[PDB]
RNA sequence: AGUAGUAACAAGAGGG
RNA sequence: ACCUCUGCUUCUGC
């Protein structure tokens, strides 16, 4: 359920998932960078 | 990780169309576009598959197949192609690719399979460890009932299963609402543990968990045990003319066992009351009966069920009883007084006639419980006052409601907001009025009232709320404390007629108090008894009795002619007596024996079909009566069937064309104008006659005289010429 | 059970001819309005739509 | 033997047999009588106190809860945007899309009843615009009448 | 109110990070070596917001709040309600500490004057950082005031509908038994 | 011709 | 004369 666009929903999921991944040990910083960065590119390309 | 998915997304968003779609499609609207298709549901899949399986590449597979398996196999077969399936990026492949993968593909480990697919694997386990008895051949009515079809469920609603599955498979997507129940939480823990690291598709996990957790049912013709482990193998255990005795591997629910114990005990009690020596007969049946090959005696020794029939059996066996019954999960023990069962009609708040039993009389009740207790008082549909205690206010709540329901008051009757299921089968009234007021007290509490209780610095109060109040409460409701010696099992004695008394000689239980409800056992009962038909059930009492008469007809006929009273008293007719309403047994007997004597007296008017039909009704000390009967009532599963004295009925009819007697729709084989055994003290001569005056009812033949012939609406639209006989026949 | 022993009982094995071709949208409009008597007008009008559309239908 | 009228909106010839003359033979007849129907329904209400009210309250609850996507369930559906049959979901998608392009989008709520609102409001449009693929793609403007006739259309086929 | 509240929220977090070791820090670059101190929850669509809440609670085994908070702090591991009010920081706090009674949420009210109020008059945010918010609020109330709109703003902080539009109404009128002139007459009958 | 049976198939569509 | 595509997709409801 949601009024959010499919894209905004996916971006917010990726961000939070990458954070918990990091502060659980599952993911390194040089991934967590790559994701949050990719997210911001998508963010801008959306613009 | 989440590495490659975001890269993909990045990729997609570079494309303008996809970006438009992704930016202008809400999450809600995704539901629509997800099903957007040019492909239609195949209308004839059987034909289409036969056609396509002739083709080189009928299967559609993910494009990644192309990197996962060789294009050709050792034998020269092409296994995949680059042709896109219409509407996707899947590609067209050969069935040879499926076999290839199955011989030479990536091997996975399957540790989770048994756990994810437990519902299915459990079926096999129960079969692998099942035991077969022999096959018996007989005709038995299979009555269509809603039954459970999936053993090992957790009795969750679809809401609660959803909530649990969300926590197990998709915990971060749960949203606001999290799990109330401790049942939910303990299931979640277990499943989380069993299915950790699981790499099977979460679609299959969720699908399986949902199938497994929710109780599912179905309407099926079923003659025997209705438990789900039996339903599961109905195809194997039950045929049109046969039973394959069988016991599934694994343990029964305590709930199924308890339920069956009650049914067995009631059947035994009801059969025993009609014997010359009830206690002797009950003891015999107790000592031969088994449930799933467990002796009933052992079950009765070790089972805590407190129920009237169960307690009669326990008394007979020298087992100590708790003279209590359960209602809504709480044990009730009446302290003082008593009341009366009464059948009367009740307009509920739904605006509905619903005419089940009332309790009418003074009754003090001590009520134990899980975490709660109370001192309910009850008159006639009255809550004289209920003082409730417990660990939590919560535990005082459940029981609080239960007790208002139990009261039978008009304030809960006219407060509900049907009496049957959809198949129009009657349901449990004083348990469903509980279920309703369970999840919605609202109306009840604000339609119950309140009370201004004195300062008496001890007896608190509960309001039309759940709130606690100082010197107010609900109408007759209190909150105090009190309530070990409730559970103490006492030594009792029992007389020849099943009356149970304490060591001081006080009447605790009488057979007439035993519920008349004819239930269906969840587990197989074998009486192993000469006092019970081999085939269980009321319908089978009917078919078996008539089948037995017919097959023994030569003997029984000569006994009818030479030695009637021995025939009437034969033991094979006692089960059938339990189908006849208690109050009618004697008059029905009297009527029957008189008709049989008239048949003897008026020579050449023998009729074997009439004798067979009426014979079971002879088996009770007869009483004198004036009453003429056009039918006898039998009670079959709570519903009167009427067997017509004259000719065929739905219950019992002779079919000329087949030359068979049909009883509730089952063949039980086969063996002048004057009818000697239809009216007592009259003969039917033949067709009515206008030249003998107008048409009387039966109940107006009253004042005719020897030799005097009338016209009678005798039954089923017929009018016949009768004659009041000149002599009489005595019994 | 509800009958007396003196009554005849017959069963019609029954089929309706031209069911689809003889039921009428206007009649179903009446049924819906009657069934929903006393209910909120928005709901009544909502349910009445289908019958009204059927009264005004055309076939390809 | 009923009454003919011309529909103001579609121009359709419309036959009304209701409260018409009573059947005169055993041939199939459509001369149903409103007052007789209402008597039967009232008789049924009497025989089932509270049934209509409850069934109505359950329907109201459903109206509130039901999502647009409920309409994705179904088989072949006449698609007025194509004047052709399509799977239900595709037909739904097409209607939603053409609606929003013509300014009807209460259904963005995601609730079915808002789509129903859109449907009725769509009939006020002077000129519903759709696109054909010429025999390529091309904008077509339907007259109010064209659109209404399509909205009220049943597609027909033979039963195999 | 919605734009205002959400601006404060955004200011509260933007340009605020955590190290490789893990000490609160401020920065103007806002960049792939550090990590945001705060999760911003406000502005997210409700379902997504709850997704974020749940994800965090599952990582910490923090209990889940009854209400949707505005932020979460990865340093103090608290959820945060922001408030903005024309009336009294004094009273609007205890208005919300009510709403959130039993919860475990740092509250942080801000008035348009400047003066603020947090939990246990204890601040998890720095002075420079709160300065900006307090300032921004006043400068907004200034832009509100000289626009004519502060006096307006400082005084705020259904049955289902379904009817027939004209065409469908006309169709309804023509779907009746023959004696009736219109749908409303028929419905009354 | 044949299949069929109240209307169809007995190749269709597109390019050149 | 060749080339290409197609074998439920202008036609299957509740
Ligand atoms: C409402 N009840 C319940 N009850 C006793 O509790 C028993 C169990 O209640 P129930 O749920 O109706 O079960 P039961 O009657 O066994 O069901 P069935 O006979 O249909 O199988 C009843 O048979 C009855 O003896 C009561 N006993 C007394 N004295 N007064 C009451 O008001 C009530
Ligand atoms: Mg028909």
TrEMBL record, chain A:
Subcellular location(s): the record lists:
Host cytoplasm; Host nucleus
Q: What does this protein do?
A: RNA-dependent RNA polymerase which is responsible for replication and transcription of virus RNA segments. The transcription of viral mRNAs occurs by a unique mechanism called cap-snatching. 5' methylated caps of cellular mRNAs are cleaved after 10-13 nucleotides by PA. In turn, these short capped RNAs are used as primers by PB1 for transcription of viral mRNAs. During virus replication, PB1 initiates RNA synthesis and copy vRNA into complementary RNA (cRNA) which in turn serves as a template for the production of more vRNAs.
Instruction: Please state what the protein is called.
Output: RNA-directed RNA polymerase catalytic subunit
Source organism (scientific name):
Influenza A virus
Name the lineage: Viruses, Riboviria, Orthornavirae, Negarnaviricota, Polyploviricotina
Its gene name is PB1
Tell me the part of the parent protein that is shown: 709 to 755 of 756
Automatic annotation (TrEMBL), chain B:
Occurrences of domain Polymerase basic protein 2 helical (ranges): 253-321
Domain (Influenza RNA polymerase PB2 middle) spans 109-250
Taking every annotated instance into account, which residue ranges of this chain make up the domain Influenza RNA polymerase PB2 C-terminal?
672-731
Q: Does the keyword S-adenosyl-L-methionine apply?
A: no
- Report domain Influenza RNA polymerase PB2 CAP binding positions: 323-525
Q: Does the keyword rRNA processing apply?
A: no
Gene3D superfamilies of this UniProt entry?
Polymerase Basic Protein 2, C-terminal domain
Q: What are its GO biological-process terms?
A: 7-methylguanosine mRNA capping; cap snatching; DNA-templated transcription; symbiont-mediated suppression of host gene expression; symbiont-mediated suppression of host mRNA transcription via inhibition of RNA polymerase II activity
| Ranges of residues in domain Influenza RNA polymerase PB2 sixth | 527-668
Q: Which SUPFAM superfamilies match?
A: PB2 C-terminal domain-like
- Residue ranges of every copy of the Influenza RNA polymerase PB2 N-terminal region domain listed in the record: 3-38
A Pfam family this chain is assigned to: Flu_PB2_4th
State the GO CC annotations.
host cell mitochondrion; host cell nucleus; virion component
Mind listing the GO molecular function terms for this protein? Answer: RNA binding
Q: Mind listing the UniProt keywords for this protein, alphabetically?
A: Cap snatching, Eukaryotic host gene expression shutoff by virus, Eukaryotic host transcription shutoff by virus, Host gene expression shutoff by virus, Host nucleus, Host-virus interaction, Inhibition of host RNA polymerase II by virus, mRNA capping, mRNA processing, Viral transcription, Virion
Compartments reported by the entry: Host mitochondrion; Virion; Host nucleus
Influenza RNA polymerase PB2 second domain residues: 39-107
Summarize the protein's role.
Plays an essential role in transcription initiation and cap-stealing mechanism, in which cellular capped pre-mRNAs are used to generate primers for viral transcription.
The record's note on quaternary structure and interaction partners says: Influenza RNA polymerase is composed of three subunits: PB1, PB2 and PA.
Tell me its family.
Belongs to the influenza viruses PB2 family.
The protein in question is named: Polymerase basic protein 2
Species this chain originates from: Influenza A virus (A/little yellow-shouldered bat/Guatemala/060/2010(H17N10))
Automatic annotation (TrEMBL), chain C:
Q: In terms of domain of life, where is this protein from? A: Viruses
**Binding-site positions, Mg(2+) 2:** 14
Q: Which residues form a coiled coil?
A: none
The residues the record assigns to binding Mg(2+) 4 are 15
Q: Where are the transmembrane segments?
A: none
Q: Which residues bind Mg(2+) 3?
A: 15-16
Name the residues that bind CTP. 18-20
Instruction: Give residues annotated as binding Mg(2+) 1.
Output: 14-15
**What the protein does?**
RNA-dependent RNA polymerase which is responsible for replication and transcription of virus RNA segments. The transcription of viral mRNAs occurs by a unique mechanism called cap-snatching. 5' methylated caps of cellular mRNAs are cleaved after 10-13 nucleotides by PA. In turn, these short capped RNAs are used as primers by PB1 for transcription of viral mRNAs. During virus replication, PB1 initiates RNA synthesis and copy vRNA into complementary RNA (cRNA) which in turn serves as a template for the production of more vRNAs.
Q: State what protein this is by name.
A: RNA-directed RNA polymerase catalytic subunit
Q: Which residues of the full protein are shown?
A: 291 to 350 of 756
TrEMBL record, chain E:
- List residues binding Mn(2+): 5, 70, 81-82
Coiled-coil residues are: none
What positions does the entry give for Mg(2+) 2 binding?
A: 42, 70
Residues given in the record as Mg(2+) 3 binding sites: 42, 70, 81
- Source taxon at top rank: Viruses
Where do the annotations place Mg(2+) 1 binding?
5, 70, 81-82
Its family remark reads: Belongs to the influenza viruses PA family.
Question: Subunit structure, per the record?
Answer: Influenza RNA polymerase is composed of three subunits: PB1, PB2 and PA.
The protein in question is named Polymerase acidic protein
Q: Which organism is it from?
A: Influenza A virus (A/little yellow-shouldered bat/Guatemala/060/2010(H17N10))
The stretch of the full-length protein covered here is 37 to 232 of 713
């Amino acid at each position: 359920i949601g009024m959010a666009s499919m894209l905004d929903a996916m971006l917010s999921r990726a961000r939070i998932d990458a954070r918990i991944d990091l502060e659980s040990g599952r993911i390194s910083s040089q991934d967590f960078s790559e994701i949050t960065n990719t997210c911001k590119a998508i963010e801008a390309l959306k613009r | 990780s989440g590495m490659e998915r975001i890269k993909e997304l990045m990729e997609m968003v570079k494309n303008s169309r996809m970006r438009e779609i992704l930016t202008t499609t809400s999450v809600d609207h995704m539901a629509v576009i997800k099903k957007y298709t040019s492909g239609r549901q195949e209308k004839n899949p059987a034909l289409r598959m036969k056609w396509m399986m002739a083709m080189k590449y009928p299967i559609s597979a993910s494009s990644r197949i192309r990197e996962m398996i060789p294009e050709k196999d050792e034998d020269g077969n092409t296994l995949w192609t680059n042709t896109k399936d219409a509407g996707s990026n899947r590609v067209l492949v050969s069935p040879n690719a499926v076999t290839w993968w199955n011989r030479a593909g990536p091997v996975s480990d399957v540790v989770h399979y048994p756990r994810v697919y437990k519902m299915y694997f459990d079926r096999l386990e129960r079969l692998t460890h099942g035991t077969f008895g022999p096959v018996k051949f007989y005709n038995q009515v299979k009555v269509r009932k809603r039954v459970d079809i999936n053993p090992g469920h957790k009795d969750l609603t679809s809401r609660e299963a959803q909530e649990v599955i969300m926590e197990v498979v998709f915990p971060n997507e749960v949203g606001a609402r999290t799990l109330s129940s401790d049942a939910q939480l303990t299931i979640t823990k277990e499943k989380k543990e069993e299915l950790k690291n699981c790499k099977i598709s979460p679609i299959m996990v969720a699908y399986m968990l949902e199938r497994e957790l929710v109780r599912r049912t179905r309407f099926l013709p079923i003659a025997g045990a209705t438990s789900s482990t039996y339903v599961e193998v109905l195809h194997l255990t039950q045929g049109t003319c046969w039973e394959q005795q069988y016991t599934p591997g694994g343990e029964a629910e305590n709930d199924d066992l308890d339920q069956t114990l009650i049914i067995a005990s009631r059947n035994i009690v009801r059969r025993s009351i009609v014997a010359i020596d009830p206690l002797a007969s009950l003891l015999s049946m107790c000592h031969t009966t088994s449930i799933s090959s467990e002796p009933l005696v052992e079950i009765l020794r070790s089972n805590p069920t407190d129920e009237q029939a169960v307690n009669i059996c326990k008394a007979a066996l020298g087992i100590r009883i708790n003279n209590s019954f359960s209602f809504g999960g709480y044990n009730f023990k009446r302290v003082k007084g008593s009341s009366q069962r009464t059948e009367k009609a009740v307009l509920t708040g739904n605006l509905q006639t619903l005419t089940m039993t009332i309790f009418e009389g003074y009754e003090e009740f001590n009520v134990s419980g899980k975490r709660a207790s109370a001192v309910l008082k009850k008159g006639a549909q009255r809550l004289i006052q209920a003082i409730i205690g417990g660990r939590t206010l919560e535990d005082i709540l459940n029981l609080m409601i239960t007790l208002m329901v139990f009261s039978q008051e008009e304030k809960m009757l006219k407060a509900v907001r049907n009496f049957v299921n959809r198949a129009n089968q009657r349901l449990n009234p004083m348990y469903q009025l509980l279920r309703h007021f369970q999840k919605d007290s609202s109306t009840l509490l604000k339609n119950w009232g309140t009370e201004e209780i004195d300062p008496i610095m001890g007896i608190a109060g509960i309001m039309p709320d759940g709130t606690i109040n100082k010197t107010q409460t609900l109408m007759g409701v209190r909150l105090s404390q009190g309530g070990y010696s409730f559970n103490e099992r006492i030594r009792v004695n029992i007389d020849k007629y099943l009356r149970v008394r304490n060591e001081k000689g006080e009447l605790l239980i009488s057979p007439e108090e035993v519920s008349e409800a004819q239930g269906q056992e969840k587990l197989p009962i074998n009486y192993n008894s000469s006092l019970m038909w081999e085939v269980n059930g009321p319908e089978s009492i009917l078919t078996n009795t008539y089948h037995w008469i017919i097959k023994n007809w030569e003997l029984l006929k000569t006994q009818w002619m030479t030695d009637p009273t021995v025939l009437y008293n034969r033991i094979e007719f006692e089960p059938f007596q339990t189908l006849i309403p208690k109050g009618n047994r004697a008059i029905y007997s009297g009527f029957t024996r008189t008709l049989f004597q008239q048949m003897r007296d008026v020579e050449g008017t023998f009729d074997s079909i009439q004798i067979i039909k009426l014979l079971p009704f002879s088996a009770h000390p007869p009483s004198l009566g004036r009453t003429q009967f056009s039918s006898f009532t039998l009670n079959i599963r709570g519903a009167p069937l009427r067997l017509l004295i004259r000719g065929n009925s739905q219950v019992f009819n002779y079919n000329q064309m087949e030359n068979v007697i049909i009883v509730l729709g089952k063949s039980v084989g086969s063996p002048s104008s004057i009818e000697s055994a239809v009216l007592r003290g009259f003969l039917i001569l033949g067709k009515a006659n206008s030249k003998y005056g107008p048409v009387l009812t039966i109940g107006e033949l009253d004042k005719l005289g020897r030799g005097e012939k009338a016209n009678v609406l005798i039954g089923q639209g017929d009018t016949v010429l009768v004659m009041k006989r000149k002599r009489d026949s005595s019994i | 059970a509800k009958s007396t022993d003196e009554e005849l009982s017959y069963t019609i094995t029954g089929d309706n001819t031209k069911w689809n071709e003889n039921q009428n949208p206007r009649i179903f409009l009446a049924m819906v309005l009657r069934i929903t008597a006393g209910q909120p007008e928005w709901f009544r009008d909502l349910l009445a739509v289908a019958p009204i559309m059927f009264s005004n239908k055309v076939a390809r | 033997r009923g009454i003919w009228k011309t529909n103001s909106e579609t121009g359709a010839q419309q036959l009304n047999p209701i409260d018409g003359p009573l059947p005169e033979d055993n041939e199939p007849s459509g001369y149903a009588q409103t007052d007789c129907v209402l008597e039967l329904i009232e008789g049924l209400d009497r025989s089932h106190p509270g049934l209509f009210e409850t069934a109505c309250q359950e329907t109201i609850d459903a109206i509130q809860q039901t999502r647009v996507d409920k309409l994705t369930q179904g088989r072949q559906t006449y698609d007025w945007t194509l004047n052709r049959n399509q799977p239900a979901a595709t037909a739904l998608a097409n209607t939603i899309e053409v609606f929003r392009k013509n300014g009807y989008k209460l259904n963005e709520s995601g609730r079915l009843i808002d789509f129903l609102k859109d449907v009725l409001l769509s009939f006020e449009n002077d000129s519903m615009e759709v696109t054909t693929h010429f025999q390529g793609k091309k904008r077509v403007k339907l007259t109010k009448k064209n659109y209404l006739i399509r909205a009220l259309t049943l597609n027909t086929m033979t039963k195999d | 109110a919605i734009s205002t509240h959400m601006e404060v929220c955004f200011m509260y977090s933007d340009f605020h990070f955590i190290d490789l070791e893990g000490n609160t820090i401020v920065k103007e670059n806002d960049d792939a070596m550090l990590k945001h101190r705060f999760e911003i929850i406000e502005g997210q669509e409700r379902n997504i917001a709850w997704t974020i809440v749940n994800s965090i609670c599952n990582m910490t085994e923090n209990s889940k709040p009854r209400f949707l908070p505005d932020l979460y702090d990865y340093k103090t591991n608290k959820f945060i309600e922001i408030g903005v009010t024309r009336r009294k920081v004094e009273d609007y706090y205890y208005e919300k500490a009510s709403k959130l009674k039993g919860e475990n949420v740092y509250i942080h009210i801000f008035s348009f004057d400047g003066e603020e109020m947090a939990t246990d008059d204890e601040y998890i945010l720095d002075e420079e950082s709160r300065a900006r918010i307090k300032t921004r609020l006043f400068v907004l109330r200034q832009e509100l005031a000289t626009a004519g709109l502060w006096d307006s703003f400082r005084q705020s902080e259904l049955e289902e509908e379904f009817s027939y539009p004209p065409t469908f109404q006309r169709l309804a009128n023509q779907s009746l038994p023959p004696s009736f002139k219109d749908y409303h007459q028929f419905k009354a009958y």
